[PDB]
Structures are given as structure tokens and as C-alpha cells.
């Protein structure tokens, strides 16, 4: 029934504090109410401390807040092997102590930031140690994969080609939200050149609320977590769909809010609104899980979608007749009291697997090579319990992820 | 006689709320209250759907099967939601995944025994059992898979009592799901081989019939459901009323199924006029047959005009002349000799109750067994292949312990089912 | 006629408080008060359980045997606790160790004489003695050991009067103790050879029957106990009431025990519906037999459906038709001819009191002698061997003056007891 | 009915003052009320003086406070033979003067600290002289055996291999509480790097209260002292079970207090909560006495235990079908007004014999050899009325305690 969550890496923790905020906010549980149902991991104390100093301070147990005073290191190796190792046990312990206390759970919603040290590496083995300790569950990892041109870390790809290959054979469904492609939404669909990280977080903090929160919440067309991976992954590769939200209108500027279904659903497939720089440049969808929430008439949907199924310029895979999982919830969304999110009475958090990422992965793989081609910051990992193996052998890994996402599509 | 409704899945469930919303009023049963019945006749036959415990608490004898709590917890937390004895709620807090395979082999298969348990507690209620009513949608997990199992088990436990099935076959134009043909083809398969009376409804055949035959501009689901539930009341419950010429599930079955497949029908209600204005009262009778027998007004998607009929059952329920009834039916059978199949001298099965739908003067449920429904399983079957060919979202099935030969099976079966049905259109 | 209850051990004791909590109200006897009896019939036969001294003080004629003060000092310091004459409390301030051997050979053996003393003071009370009621658990010292001794002595003192035994056989799933099968196997042994009517109850057969047959979410012990005590009231006390066809311990015994082992039964109550809602009143009668004869609802752990019956005794107590009673019983005997053994043309022993359980309209205690209880002594017997083999916590027995041949004895005996019982299932 | 207690050795006296504190505290008998029912022995005055100067000063009779102004000596020999001898008579006298005054007693709860001078030696002969003067009773000695790595005395093992061999053939059931493994609980399950001895004492001071205090106290499933040894020792070796407590939650930090049975019982078998560094590294339990107290439904137990009996990873001995003595008391625990103990409304003081100590004894025996192998501080005992005999012959002793705890398990 439940779904634990492990927010790993400063980012996964910032986003965590955010997604965790939106929660109580739409459940009437102020600062000090019940008890969360997740954990927080980081090898840099000062960040988890922000959850220990700032807002939502006492809504957590100093037990579900793991820290390694030591060093973060923007390098996979160190975070996965060398350092990150020391903490893992302890980490697990909570996701085994928190996993027990419950009643027939469904899985762990993992929150990490692909291209980091504590986020890429660590998790790599966290999800790793999970796939074995609970192979019998769902492993949906919600990632924030590398901005297409606006990356931060100098190494980023090293850290992301490595978190992909190690987690690939362990996740159930990996959701993806592109940090940059979300900015566009903040520039083009909300207008603000002042987007603090605290915003992107409010956003995913939204799209995510549509996943677990409301879905695990009764409705006219419930959709379990398992449901996802089933209706969402055509193949064992921990396939990565993309998150998209519909009423991303500004709560100040424009106001046409009352945008009946027929509109908000069409607003999902236009590439300029998908929290991912993977513009459907060719990527044929192969399965979409249209999660609606608020006042929505099933016919409105079983029509708004019909209209789409016949737009053709939206070309769905061949081997897939119908790939539209319509998830209907009741309670409308719940916008921050005064952030910058419109606040409509219905939304569409549609996520999907698109042959599109054939790109995004490509463009991120290429990156890697360029540097590896010169070993660049390699000495930083080797000296951290890794080898020419793990790199070269994780490169070959993704290689067959560029062929995979190619074969499962583009061909009939 | 008796029957025991079955609310499989969410849809089948959502509808339960509407089928019982209605039926009750058509039997004067308030939430937990008793029989306030404006009359005294809406009681001598209730048993068919309730049970005597207190003396004011006649509880609906149905089953609520679903792997998604929130649903039944919306039906149980709203209006009439507090009339079902909790024992009726056979939930599966598991992940009600939208996979036919997840609610038929892996997740549902567990919750089954805890269902059959009750389906027996209700069957062994009292008097004599007739059959079970089954509501669900062939486009999801808890619906097509788990509900299609519930029957395969029911039909092994009492291959004597009947099995009416109310299926919400995947509407054409737009599919309210993606694998739809997967969850569907797989459930129709189970249907063609267990239940022996199926009434296929189409969310969009309804809209139409609900937005143009009822100037209704905002047809919420509640409505569609409501309209449907209107037909299933005319069918069953109705005939369990007096009549110059009354029938009952069997008559309906033994007059409508020429060949064992089970065959699926297409229900149609009679007075379907918009509120205020339209209240034309042109309901002498030629007006009802006018209605019922037109293309639009067939809850099905397909249009009768696109294929002969094998059988028809105008189950009227309102004082009328066994002459103006028996007569009309004829001209109708001659004006359209074209489509009405010939090797059956009298396709039509005239049925006639007495008391009408509570507030109306004269109505007549239509249960057509036309060969037209060929052009629907075709549809479904097509969608399958076009996507099966590429094994589209197949990993969500197999990965749930399924078979690559299972899908083959169903399609073929249900695909052959299309074939046969044509054997009569000719 | 008469009887003298016996509260051996804590459990048997804890239950005493519930058996007397009930029974009293079913006889209008307030704490120390007298007969407030809503009626006048709840008095002409009380004697069976009390004694006349003052004129408002009818004191329960039971025995409270236990080697743990705190216990009886909880039963004597609470509600009805102040109705037992102190003379009744046969305590053993010793160390009430959880060893069958510690309460049967070493510690209990001393306190015995000071018990028998009273069991005679009560027996030689007045009129004519029928038998003694015995409550306890076969999973501890003061229960299985010392209580199993109390009887071995009783049955030497009056091999005429009967001996009903209410044992709380070690529940399966989870054992509320560790040596359990040790304390058990050893007490069942003593039972199969002294008492001649045993009613085995299972703390978890109760939970179930108490958490699903009574939507009761927090079934405290008090409850379980309460439910049990409900059955033992229907048995005895009840039949000591008028009836179209009344029986009494013997009838019950002389109709239920085909072969001298003593055989153990499995009690089942009739109206077992959740408070508010469920109060369906579907208690015409087919509803009671519906109840009583189902699997769940058998205080035992095993399920009847897993083995024929030798005898059955529906001891009903509420105005009904000797026709709708005598009749029902039949169909029941024919719908399940399969399991009901054949060499007994009429297994069932219909019994019929008149006055029902104080606040209810119609009830019926069920005392089944099914061969199914084979699959329980098996259980117990298994647990033994698996641990005996390694002499697990055996030093706590031997070190208390026991024998390595004593354990052998019991197991075998009780183990053979399993054997025999099968001799009829076939 | 009763059970005298002899707190021997400074430690056994500190722990004594503690266990003795918790007592009145949950019996409404302030500083000056009734009269204890125990004695205090030590060959170093200044410590028993602490009971004569500090709190609970007048709650004792200067008669049940034995002291030997002389010298303690962290050496068995001296405490057992040479010095300790002189006092014993007098000591006994009280446990014969206090043993008479009562009404049909059950035994003497002895409190000593294995690796000391007055605690190891002395008692050795105290329990020694008891097993003969009252063979017809219970001799449950509550020990605080040598911290696995954090010992104090340099000789410790000499003193503990000697208190074991001499008491072995005299005790009924020896409870064991590991000083170090209790610290972990203070670090990991209560959080405090400031644990004063006065705390560990409050703890055992708790687990002990669950033994005698409450048990000898009426309840829904009483358990006599005899009960223990019977349901707890499979073999004459004065077998040593381990003490464990369940709600060891902090009365400040976290607060989930309301931790229904189903939880507190599972919290007993996780090795990080057992007052003993004998982590069930393999040691198969062979009998556990789950003493519960507070609001507990017998079914809750006769279920919570059932669930356990089938966890298998908790492997119980072979020759033992069922080894679960369920002891239910009424009155919930009673935490110090303001120490650091949570204060729940139900607890589980489960003690047991585990083939685990096969370790703990091993690791403590080995110690011994190393030193004996060089005679180390041998001249300190010899010169105190001992011989190469007592050592070598007490070593051989335990040897068959390493084989014993091995044979009674690991084999089927």
C-alpha cells in the first residue's frame, strides 16, 4: 500500500524538502502534526542540516536523517565505493526499519540527482542493495538528469553515465525531470528570470505530488505504483519516462485558468512544457500515464485522448495499439499559498517513455567520451577504488541503451 | 427467485453505485432505511436483490471487488454507500495496476478466494438462486482481469444459475486507457466462455445518446452510469414484477441465444426525451418502438442498421395493449425484413411487465442480439494486433507472470468470435 | 441436580471471572447481592451452581486453584471477585513455575490435599451431584499439571459424577509460551483418561471468530474469555432450564461419546453478529444452523470440513418449532452426508431449552464431536517430538522430579489418541 | 514467596543502589517508608559508605550493610580466599538472619560484577556457602560480565574465569548484562555520549525491575522465580541467559512511544538492544522468557510471538519445539522522573539462553590464557592463598563450558 522514499544527494534533499512540503500542505498537517515515511542521505552535513535547521524541522526523526560529516566529493567513485560505502549499512537500516514498521508496502520512491557525488554514486549502491533485499517490490527512482547545456559539475557525465549503468539493472521505473528544460517553463510558461532552485523544486514538488500523494489517494480511476512500471515500461531496462504537468500557468500574469480538460491535455504534448530537454524531436511515445486530478469527466478524457490518438503528428510506437493509462483522481491540485503557481481546479501530470531520450542519453554519453578520451578527471576516481574497468565497462553499458532505445522504436 | 450483483473493478463499481442508486428508489429502499415504497408491489419480489436481517434493513446482495481502496472508499463514503454490509467489500489494497494480468493471475488471484467465499455466503442466502449480475470495464485490471476471473470461478460453482454480464467495451473514437485492447481482448475471451448474457455499453455511444437524445450539455460520468443502470433495471428487477406476459433472465436467455457462444447484446431504453420541453408524452407505443429500434439509442457503439438481428427482446413495463404491442413489433419486423435475419420467423421476443419506471407512464427495455456487434470485436481485435505485433506494453503483462501464448489465445478466440457472428449476417 | 466449577491455573481462573461474570447475570446474581432476576425461572434451578447461606448470598460453588497469588488476587480484587467465599481460594504462594511437572508432582502435589478437602466440602453440599466443570489451559503449570491432577483425584473420588473439561489447547500460528507442547501433551494425556467431556478452545480460533464474525477490532482477552463463557453457559446451566426437549450433561455425554476415550468436542455459539448493523435478526433458525455448522465459528482451531463428525448436539435455547428444528437438522445431515460419518443414522442430538440468553431472542450452543480434532493433537504431538528429540527445556521438568519415560508415555498415549480418532474418519 | 538479594562488589552495589531506587519509585515508598530485603557487601568501605552517605540513606539497616575496612584488591584470590574470607561468616549471618525473618522464601537475587575483587572472589564463596546452606532454593545471580573490548581492570579475565568456575556449580540461573553492549544502547537507542555509570545502572535497574519486582507482583500470567530456571535452563550448568529490554526509547528526542506490542517484541531480537555484546552471531536461542508489563492483550502476544516463531532467521534450537515463556504483568513500567528513559505504557524484558555466549565465553577465556601463558599477575594471587591449581584447574573448567554451549546446540 505505501511507498517509502529515499532522498539522496543535496539536490535530492532540496527537491525532497520541496516535494515533502507540498505534501502536508495539501493534507492539512502543519509543521508539527504526524510522521513522514522517508529518509535523507548526504555525505555533506550542512545540507541535511538545512532540514534540521530550516522549515519542516520537527516533522522528521533525527533517525531518518542520515549524514556523513565527512566529504561529499563531486565524484561517483568516492561516493559509491570509498566513502559512500561506510554509510550505506546505516542508510539501509532505516529503509529496513522504516520498511518493517508499515503494512504491506509497494516500494521506495528514490530521489537523486544523477550528476552528483552523493547522488550518483551512493544511490547507485543503495538502489543496488535494495534490488536484492526487496526484489519483490517497486523501485521507481525519480531523477534530475544533467542539463543539456547548462550542467554544473565539470565531470557531471562521469557521474551520470555511472549512476545509470549501476542503477539500470535495479530500478523499476525511473522518472526524469530535466533541470534546464524546467527553467524554460519558468521563463516561457510563468515568466520569471528569477527562478530560485527553491522553485524548480516546487515544480517537481508538484509533478511528484501527482504521482504518489494523490494517486495512492482514492479516486475515480486509481493507479497503483506497480500499475506504473506495468503500464509504463515495455522492457526490463529500468526505463525512464518523462514528467510533464499541464496547468503550469502563472498565478499573477495571465488568467484563463478555466481551461477545460480538452485544453490542459493538449498542453502536455507540446514539447515546451515537459520538464525535460528531450523535445519529441522524433521519439515516438510508447506509453503514457495521464494522471488527472480535480474535476474531470471520464468522457472528457475518453475523448480528449481520442482526439489525440488521431493527431498522428504525435506518432506512437507501432507495436503499441493503445498506450494511454488514464489515471483520474478527485481532489484538485494544491498550489503553494503564494509561490508563483496559478492554482487551477484540474491538472494533467502525464509521464511517459518516449523514444526521444534516444537523444538525451546520446548527447550525455558523447560528453563522457570526450573527457574519458583524455582521462580528464579520471585520477579522481581511480584513487577512490574504481578502475579503467568500471568506466569503460559502464560506457559499453549505456552504448546498448542507445541501441535499445533505438530498436524498441524507429522500426516496425 | 434471486440474483447477486457483482461490482468488479472501479467502473463496474462506480456503476454499482448508480445501479443501486436507481434500483433502490425503484424499490423504495432509503440508504439504510427500509421499504418506503409508494406502493406495495415494489416489495413482494425484492428478495431478488436483498436480504432480511433487521426489519428495515434490506441490504443489497452484491459484491464489491477491487484492488484500489480509494474507489470503494468513495462509493462507501458517499450517498447510498452505507447500505452494503462491510462483508460485501472484497478489497485488495495491493497495487491495482492497470494490467489484466495483474488482476487475473498475480494480484487478483489471491483476493479471489476471499471473494468466492462471500459469493457463496450470498448464494446460499435463501430460496432459489437464478443468476448473478456482473458490472465492469474491459479496459483495466480489476475490471477485465479480476472480474473475468470471478466469473470463470462462479461458472464452475453453479453452471446452472445464469450469468448476465454488463461490460463497458472499449469505446472507439478515444480510449480512456492505453493497453485497452490488451485488457479487453483478454476479458472478452473469458466472457465468450462463461457468462451467458452480456450487455455491452460504450461510454461514447452514451455520450452521443446522452448529448443529442438528451440535450444534456455536461454529461458527467454519473449520468452515463445512470442511463446504463436504467436499462439493467428494466431487464432484471423489472421482469421480477407481474405482467400480462412476463419473462425472466432465462426466458430472456432462452429466447435470445441461438448459439452457445453466449452472444452479446446491446441494451436500449424507451422514453429517452430531454427534460422540460421534449416531455412530449408521444409514448402511446409506436413511439417507444420508434425509439428502441433506431440506430442512435443503442448503448452499443455499432449501429444495428449495419447487420441483421438474431433476437430482440422488447421488455416493456407499463400498462399497454397486448395488441398494440404484439402488433407494432410485426410491422417493425416487416419494414426491416432486410435486417432481422430470416431463419427465425419471429426474432422478436415481446415481454410485458405492468408497473413502469416509478415516475414514468410507459417504458420498454430493448435487448438486441444483432450481428452488428461483429463490427466491434473487430475493432478491439484490430487494436490488439496493431500493437501486439510490436509487443507494445507487453512487459507489464509477462513481467507479471503471463504467457506469449495467452495473448495469442484470446485474440484468436475472440477473433474467431467475430467470424462466427457473420455466419448469420449471411 | 448440581455441579462444581473448577478454576485451575490463571487462565482457567481468568475465565472463571468471565464464566461467572456471565452466568450470574444469566441468573440475576449481583456481586454479593442475591437474585434480582428479571424473571422467576432463573432461580428454580440455580442450585446447580450456588449455595444457600444468608438469603441474598448465593455463592458460586467453584474452586480457584493456582500457585501464583497475584492472579487470584486480581480476580478477587476486581468486579464479581468478592462473591466467592474465601474458602474457595486454594492458592499456592509457591513459585507457580511454568512447568507441568512443577504443578503436578512437586509444587502442586502439596496444595492438592488442601483442594480435594474443599472439592469434598462442596460436593457433599446437598441434593445430588451431577459433575464438575473444569477450566484451564494446557500450556502452563497451574493449568495443565496441577489442574490435570485435580481431576485424576476427582475421578477416583466419584467415578460416577461427570467431568466436563474446558481446555484452551495451544493455539497454532503462535504459542503464548515456549514449552507449550510439553505442558500440553502431558495434560491431554491425563484428560483422555479421566474427564469424559472436553471442550477445546483456541485463543486464535477465537480471535478470528471474534475479529471477522464480530467486526471487533481490539479483541482483548476479556472478550475471548467472554465468548467462551458464553458457550459453557449454553451447555450446562442452560439445559438445567425447562424445554420441549431438554437434556443434561449426561444426555450430552451419553449421546456424544461413542467410544470411552472421552473424546473432545468443539463448541460453537449461535447468534454471533456484530453489534449495531449486523443486528439482522436473521435468526428464524435456518440462520442459526447456518451459523453453528460453518467452518469458521468453531471455537476449535481445526475446521470440521476437514473430517467427519461422530456426534453433534445443537443445544438451542429460545422458543422455536420442534419441527423447524428437527427438520433443519436433517437437510443439514443430508447436504453434508459426506462429512458426518455413516454408522450413526442420526449423528445430531437436537436439544431444546425454552428461555434464551437473557437479552437475545434465539440462540443455540453447538457441541461437535468431529474427527477433525485429529488435526490438532497431531499438531501438539508434532511440536513435542521436534523438541523432545533434543530434550529442549527438559531439565526444568526432570530437575523437578520427573521421568524421561513420563514424557514418552504422554506423547504416545495422546499420540495414539490421534490414531484412533481416524478409525472413524474412515 | 520472597527473594533476598546480595549486592556484592562496589559495582554490584552501585547497580544495587540503582535497582533499589527504581523499586520504591514504583511502589510509592519515599526515602523513609518500609524496610528493604537485601544486603550489601564490599571490602572497600568508601563505596558502601555511598549508600550510607548518599540517597536512600535511612532506607537500610546498618546491619544489611557489610564492609571490611581492609582492602578490596582487584584480584579474585585475595577477595575469595585470604581477605574476603574473614567477612563471609558475618555476611552469611545476615542472609540467614534475613532469610529467617521472612515467610517461605524462594531464593536470593545476587548482584555482582564478574571481573572485580570483591565481586568475583568473595561471592564465589558466598554463593558457594549458599548452595549448601539452602540447596533447596533458587540462586539466580545477576552479573555484569567483562566488556568485550572495553574492560577496566588489567586482570579482569583472571577474576572472571574464576568467578564462573566457582559459582557454576552453585547458581540456578545467572543473568548477564554486558557493560559495553549497554553503552551502545545509550549511544544508538537513546543518544548520549555522556552515559554516567549512574545510567547503565538505571537501565539494568529497569530490566531487573521486570524480573523480580513486577513479576513477584500479581498479573495476567504470573511467573515465579523458580519458573525461570525451570523454563530457562536446559542444563545444570548455572546457565546464563541475557537480559534485554524493549521500549528503550529516549524521553526527549524521538516520540513514537505508542509502539504496540507487535513492535516492542520485534525490538528485542534485533541484536542492537540486548545489554550484551553477544550479538546472535549464530547462537540459537533455546528458551526465552518474554516478560511483558503494562497494557498487553494475550492474543497480541500469542501472535506477535507466533509471527516470530516463523521468522526462521531467528533459528531456535532443534531439541526445542517451543521455548517461549510468556510472562504478563499489569502495571506498566516506571521510569525515573527525569533521567533519560522514554516512559512507555508497555515493555518487554526478554531474557534467554542463547548458544551465542559460546562466543562471549570464548573471547573471555582466550584473554585469560594469553596472560596465564606468561603468569602475568599470577604472583598476586598465589601470595594470596591460591595455586597453579585453581587457575589451570578453573581454565579446564570453562573449557567444558565452551564445549557445553557448543554441544547443546549447533548439532541436531
From Swiss-Prot, chains A, D:
Single GO BP term: cellular response to interleukin-4
E.C. designation(s): 3.6.5.-
MF terms (GO), sorted A to Z: double-stranded RNA binding; GTP binding; GTPase activity; metal ion binding; structural constituent of cytoskeleton; ubiquitin protein ligase binding
Gene3D superfamilies according to UniProt: Helix hairpin bin, Tubulin/FtsZ, C-terminal domain, Tubulin/FtsZ, GTPase domain
Entries under CDD domains matching the protein: alpha_tubulin (cd02186)
Chain positions with Omega-N-methylarginine modification: 312
InterPro entries: Alpha_tubulin, Tub_FtsZ_C, Tubulin, Tubulin/FtsZ-like_C, Tubulin/FtsZ_2-layer-sand-dom, Tubulin/FtsZ_GTPase_sf, Tubulin_C, Tubulin_CS
Residues at which Mg(2+) binds: 44
Modification 3'-nitrotyrosine, positions: 255
Binding site residues for GTP: 10, 44, 113, 117-118, 152, 179, 201
Cofactor field: Mg(2+)
PTM characteristics: Some glutamate residues at the C-terminus are polyglycylated, resulting in polyglycine chains on the gamma-carboxyl group. Glycylation is mainly limited to tubulin incorporated into axonemes (cilia and flagella) whereas glutamylation is prevalent in neuronal cells, centrioles, axonemes, and the mitotic spindle. Both modifications can coexist on the same protein on adjacent residues, and lowering polyglycylation levels increases polyglutamylation, and reciprocally. Cilia and flagella glycylation is required for their stability and maintenance. Flagella glycylation controls sperm motility.
Phosphoserine modified-residue sites: 205, 412
Stated role: Tubulin is the major constituent of microtubules, a cylinder consisting of laterally associated linear protofilaments composed of alpha- and beta-tubulin heterodimers. Microtubules grow by the addition of GTP-tubulin dimers to the microtubule end, where a stabilizing cap forms. Below the cap, tubulin dimers are in GDP-bound state, owing to GTPase activity of alpha-tubulin.
Subunit and partners: Dimer of alpha and beta chains. A typical microtubule is a hollow water-filled tube with an outer diameter of 25 nm and an inner diameter of 15 nM. Alpha-beta heterodimers associate head-to-tail to form protofilaments running lengthwise along the microtubule wall with the beta-tubulin subunit facing the microtubule plus end conferring a structural polarity. Microtubules usually have 13 protofilaments but different protofilament numbers can be found in some organisms and specialized cells.
Protein name: Tubulin alpha-1B chain
Organism: Bos taurus (Bovine)
Swiss-Prot record, chains B, C:
Protein location: Cytoplasm, Cytoskeleton
Phosphothreonine: residues carrying this PTM: 54, 284, 289
Entry binding sites for Mg(2+): 68
SMART domains for this protein: Tubulin (SM00864), Tubulin_C (SM00865)
Modification sites for N6-succinyllysine: 57
Motif MREI motif, residue range(s) on this chain: 1-3
Sites of N6-acetyllysine modification: 57
SUPFAM superfamilies on file: Tubulin C-terminal domain-like (SSF55307), Tubulin nucleotide-binding domain-like (SSF52490)
GO terms classed as biological process: microtubule cytoskeleton organization; microtubule-based process; mitotic cell cycle; neuron migration; positive regulation of axon guidance
Posttranslational modification: Some glutamate residues at the C-terminus are polyglycylated, resulting in polyglycine chains on the gamma-carboxyl group. Glycylation is mainly limited to tubulin incorporated into axonemes (cilia and flagella) whereas glutamylation is prevalent in neuronal cells, centrioles, axonemes, and the mitotic spindle. Both modifications can coexist on the same protein on adjacent residues, and lowering polyglycylation levels increases polyglutamylation, and reciprocally. The precise function of polyglycylation is still unclear.
GO MF annotation list: GTP binding; GTPase activity; metal ion binding; protein heterodimerization activity; structural constituent of cytoskeleton
Subunit structure comment from the entry: Dimer of alpha and beta chains. A typical microtubule is a hollow water-filled tube with an outer diameter of 25 nm and an inner diameter of 15 nM. Alpha-beta heterodimers associate head-to-tail to form protofilaments running lengthwise along the microtubule wall with the beta-tubulin subunit facing the microtubule plus end conferring a structural polarity. Microtubules usually have 13 protofilaments but different protofilament numbers can be found in some organisms and specialized cells.
Protein name from the UniProt record: Tubulin beta-2B chain
Source species taxonomy: Eukaryota, Metazoa, Chordata, Craniata, Vertebrata
The encoding gene: TUBB2B
Amino acid at each position: 500500500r505505501e511507498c517509502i522514499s529515499i532522498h539522496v544527494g543535496q539536490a535530492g534533499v532540496q527537491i525532497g524538502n520541496a516535494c515533502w512540503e507540498l505534501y502536508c500542505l495539501e493534507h492539512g498537517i502543519q509543521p508539527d502534526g504526524h510522521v513522514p515515511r522517508a529518509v535523507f542521505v548526504d555525505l555533506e552535513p550542512t545540507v541535511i542540516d538545512e532540514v534540521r535547521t530550516g522549515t519542516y524541522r520537527q516533522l522528521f526523526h533525527p533517525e531518518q536523517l542520515i549524514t556523513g560529516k565527512e566529504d561529499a566529493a563531486n565524484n561517483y567513485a568516492r561516493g559509491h565505493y570509498t566513502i559512500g560505502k561506510e554509510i550505506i549499512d546505516l542508510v539501509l537500516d532505516r529503509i529496513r526499519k522504516l520498511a518493517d514498521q508499515c503494512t504491506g508496502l509497494q516500494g521506495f520512491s528514490v530521489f537523486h540527482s544523477f550528476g552528483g557525488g552523493t547522488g550518483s554514486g551512493f544511490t547507485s549502491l543503495l538502489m543496488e542493495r535494495l534490488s536484492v533485499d526487496y526484489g519483490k517490490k517497486s523501485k521507481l527512482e525519480f531523477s534530475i538528469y544533467p542539463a543539456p547545456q547548462v550542467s554544473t559539475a565539470v565531470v557531471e557525465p562521469y557521474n551520470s553515465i555511472l549512476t545509470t549503468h549501476t542503477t539500470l539493472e535495479h530500478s523499476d521505473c525511473a522518472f526524469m525531470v530535466d533541470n534546464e528544460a524546467i527553467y524554460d517553463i519558468c521563463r516561457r510558461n510563468l515568466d520569471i528570470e528569477r527562478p530560485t532552485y527553491t522553485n524548480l523544486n516546487r515544480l517537481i514538488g508538484q509533478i511528484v505530488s501527482s504521482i504518489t500523494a494523490s494517486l495512492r489517494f482514492d479516486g475515480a480511476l486509481n493507479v497503483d505504483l506497480t500499475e506504473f512500471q506495468t503500464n509504463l515500461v515495455p522492457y526490463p531496462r529500468g526505463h525512464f519516462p518523462l514528467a510533464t504537468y499541464a496547468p503550469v500557468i502563472s498565478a499573477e500574469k495571465a488568467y484563463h485558468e478555466q481551461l477545460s480538460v480538452a485544453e490542459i491535455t493538449n498542453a502536455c504534448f507540446e514539447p515546451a512544457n515537459q520538464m525535460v530537454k528531450c523535445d519529441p524531436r522524433h521519439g515516438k511515445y510508447m506509453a503514457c500515464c495521464l494522471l488527472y486530478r480535480g474535476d474531470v469527466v471520464p468522457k472528457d478524457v475518453n475523448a480528449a485522448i481520442a482526439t489525440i490518438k488521431t493527431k498522428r503528428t504525435i506518432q506512437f510506437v507501432d507495436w503499441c495499439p493503445t498506450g494511454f493509462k488514464v489515471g483520474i483522481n478527485y481532489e484538485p491540485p494544491t498550489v503553494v499559498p503564494g509561490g508563483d503557481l496559478a492554482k487551477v481546479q484540474r491538472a494533467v501530470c502525464m509521464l511517459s517513455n518516449t523514444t526521444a531520450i534516444a537523444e538525451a542519453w546520446a548527447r550525455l554519453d558523447h560528453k563522457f567520451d570526450l573527457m574519458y578520451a583524455k582521462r580528464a578527471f579520471v585520477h579522481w576516481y581511480v584513487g577512490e577504488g574504481m578502475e579503467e574497468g568500471e568506466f569503460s565497462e559502464a560506457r559499453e553499458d549505456m552504448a546498448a541503451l542507445e541501441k535499445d532505445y533505438e530498436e524498441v522504436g524507429v522500426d516496425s | 427467485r434471486e440474483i447477486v450483483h457483482i461490482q468488479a473493478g472501479q467502473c463496474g463499481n462506480q456503476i454499482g453505485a448508480k445501479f443501486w442508486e436507481v434500483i433502490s428508489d425503484e424499490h423504495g429502499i432509503d440508504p439504510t432505511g427500509s421499504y418506503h415504497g409508494d406502493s406495495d408491489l415494489q416489495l413482494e419480489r425484492i428478495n431478488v436483490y436483498y436480504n432480511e436481517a433487521a426489519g428495515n434493513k434490506y441490504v443489497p446482495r452484491a459484491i464489491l471487488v477491487d484492488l484500489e481502496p480509494g474507489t470503494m472508499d468513495s462509493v462507501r463514503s458517499g450517498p447510498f454507500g452505507q447500505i452494503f454490509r462491510p462483508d460485501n467489500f472484497v478489497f485488495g489494497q495491493s497495487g491495482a495496476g492497470n494490467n489484466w494480468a495483474k488482476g487475473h493471475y498475480t494480484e487478483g488471484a489471491e483476493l479471489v478466494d476471499s471473494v468466492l467465499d462471500v459469493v457463496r455466503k450470498e448464494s446460499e442466502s435463501c430460496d432459489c438462486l437464478q443468476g448473478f449480475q456482473l458490472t465492469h470495464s474491459l479496459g483495466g485490471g480489476t475490471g477485465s482481469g479480476m472480474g473475468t476471473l470471478l466469473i470463470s470461478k462462479i461458472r464452475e460453482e453453479y453452471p446452472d444459475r445464469i450469468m448476465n454480464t454488463f461490460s463497458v467495451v472499449p469505446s472507439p473514437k478515444v480510449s480512456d486507457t492505453v493497453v485497452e485492447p490488451y485488457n479487453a481482448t483478454l476479458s472478452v475471451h473469458q466472457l465468450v466462455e462463461n457468462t451467458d448474457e452480456t450487455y455491452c455499453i460504450d461510454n461514447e455511444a452514451l455520450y452521443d445518446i446522452c448529448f443529442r437524445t438528451l440535450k444534456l450539455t455536461t454529461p458527467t460520468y454519473g449520468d452515463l452510469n445512470h442511463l446504463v443502470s436504467a436499462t439493467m433495471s428494466g431487464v432484471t428487477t423489472c421482469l421480477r414484477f407481474p405482467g400480462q406476459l412476463n419473462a425472466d433472465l432465462r426466458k430472456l436467455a432462452v429466447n435470445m441465444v441461438p448459439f452457445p457462444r453466449l452472444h452479446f447484446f446491446m441494451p436500449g431504453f424507451a422514453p429517452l426525451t430531454s427534460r422540460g420541453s421534449q416531455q412530449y408524452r408521444a409514448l402511446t407505443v409506436p413511439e417507444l418502438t420508434q425509439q428502441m429500434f433506431d440506430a442512435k439509442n443503442m448503448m452499443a457503439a455499432c449501429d444495428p442498421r449495419h447487420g441483421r438481428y438474431l433476437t430482440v427482446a422488447a421488455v416493456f413495463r407499463g400498462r399497454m395493449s397486448m395488441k398494440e404491442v404484439d402488433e407494432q413489433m410485426l410491422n417493425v419486423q416487416n419494414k426491416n425484413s432486410s435486417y432481422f435475419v430470416e431463419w427465425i420467423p419471429n426474432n422478436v421476443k415481446t415481454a410485458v411487465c405492468d408497473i413502469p419506471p416509478r415516475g414514468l407512464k410507459m417504458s420498454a427495455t430493448f435487448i438486441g442480439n444483432s450481428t452488428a456487434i461483429q463490427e466491434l470485436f473487430k475493432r478491439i481485435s484490430e487494436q490488439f494486433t496493431a500493437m501486439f505485433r510490436r509487443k507494445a506494453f507487453l512487459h507489464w503483462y509477462t513481467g507479471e507472470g503471463m504467457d506469449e501464448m495467452e495473448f495469442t489465445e484470446a485474440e484468436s478466440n475472440m477473433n474467431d468470435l467475430v467470424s462466427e457472428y457473420q455466419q448469420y449476417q449471411d
